Design a protein around this ligand. Structure first.
Ligand SMILES: [Mg+2]
Ligand SMILES: [Mg+2]
Ligand SMILES: [Mg+2]
Length: 236
């Protein structure tokens, strides 16, 4: 992989840039925000999805899809509604792939052309310890034992693992249309010398057959902790 030198090519301040390897920038567009700008609206075709949701859930939905449309604009794609498929996945315009994520203080979208990008998965979470009991439910025993060997003790690697499980599913589902449980992938980590970024690889433990290509046995990705946020990204 290899990220770009930090801040170079006008990436200073861009959190998602620290999980995108240098070789994927030519294929991917991205947009991120740290708040819900006032005045944003859903497209009419998107509005029914949130008709009965509280304002905070509307704001997440509206903002992150505003991001998705900024990214799509950078690739020459006209505004389109981003609906949801039958297991919650974003429905992208013709010929496009992408991933959406949002959490406290972050909204982000990464998009690409199916011609050049097989699949994308991103996830963001606040950089805080997991609530009690959650780690056991989202991890495998061999996973938990190995994280203290590969990850900084100063970081909430339980939250980072969780985030990587989420990014793994988001990259996996558009290619398989099958559910990947938390126990269905074993993720191993690597930490960069600088201590706040690194790599991961998700080893698939179940049938990895895809509708249109070679089976998925492993999915490589990147992780970063910056400005109180954890980010993970997978680009296949
Ligand atoms: Mg998430
Ligand atoms: Mg350790
Ligand atoms: Mg990749």
């Amino acid at each position: 992989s290899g990220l770009v030198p930090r801040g170079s090519h006008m990436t200073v301040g861009t959190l998602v840039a620290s999980v995108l390897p240098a070789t994927v920038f030519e294929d991917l567009a991205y947009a991120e925000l740290y708040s819900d700008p006032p005045g944003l609206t859903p497209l009419p075709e998107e509005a029914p999805l949130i008709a009965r949701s509280v304002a905070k859930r509307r704001n997440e939905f509206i903002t992150v899809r505003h991001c998705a449309r900024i990214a799509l604009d950078q690739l020459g794609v006209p505004p389109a509604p981003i609906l949801k498929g039958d297991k919650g996945e974003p429905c992208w315009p013709d010929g496009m792939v992408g991933s959406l994520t949002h959490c406290a203080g972050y909204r982000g979208a990464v998009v690409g052309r199916r011609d050049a990008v097989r699949s994308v998965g991103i996830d963001a979470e606040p950089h805080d310890v997991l609530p009690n009991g959650v780690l056991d439910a989202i991890s495998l025993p061999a996973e938990r034992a190995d994280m203290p060997r590969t990850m900084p003790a100063a970081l909430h690697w339980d939250r980072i693992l969780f985030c990587a499980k989420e990014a793994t599913y988001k990259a996996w589902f558009p290619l398989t249309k099958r559910w990947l449980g938390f126990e269905d992938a074993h993720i191993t980590f690597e930490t960069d010398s600088t201590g706040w970024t690194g790599r991961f690889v998700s080893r698939i433990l179940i049938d990895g057959s895809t509708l249109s290509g070679p089976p998925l046995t492993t999915l490589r990705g990147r992780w970063s902790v910056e400005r109180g946020l954890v980010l993970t990204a997978i680009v296949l």
